[PDB]
Amino acid sequence: MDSETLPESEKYNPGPQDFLLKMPGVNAKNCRSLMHHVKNIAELAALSQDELTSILGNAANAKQLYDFIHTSFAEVVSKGKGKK
């Protein structure tokens, strides 16, 4: 919401914006609110689940997203050697 994030021409680049909308836990409603509360990927992944719950307004979306952010490429690949 700073001078750099406020788009004059207002195109909305379908790279990073769309990048959100394809993530589990994201809808356009909470994407736009997100978009105002986060910079991009870095800060999005830096945000806690609780922050996402505040932005998205649902712990469902927040958990889905937060979990997707933390799910290692080689995590779910295992079935549960260390049973949690």
Next chain:
Amino acid sequence: MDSETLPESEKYNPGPQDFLLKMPGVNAKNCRSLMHHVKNIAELAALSQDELTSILGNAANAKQLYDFIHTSFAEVVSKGKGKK
């Protein structure tokens, strides 16, 4: 790397794996390398371009990816920061 990372099913869950591969600056060679240096999205977005150049071995890929990680959804659109 530990027993943690060792895939039982060796499925390689496509979701986050492919999530990398679609990012500008990511190729399978540097993705696999990344995959060994990065947990998931959070660590990727936490890593600096220095780290990316080390992992990917290319400054080109590192710069492309670093840019993508740190460019707000509307930042490319914002003519206040860049462009003419």
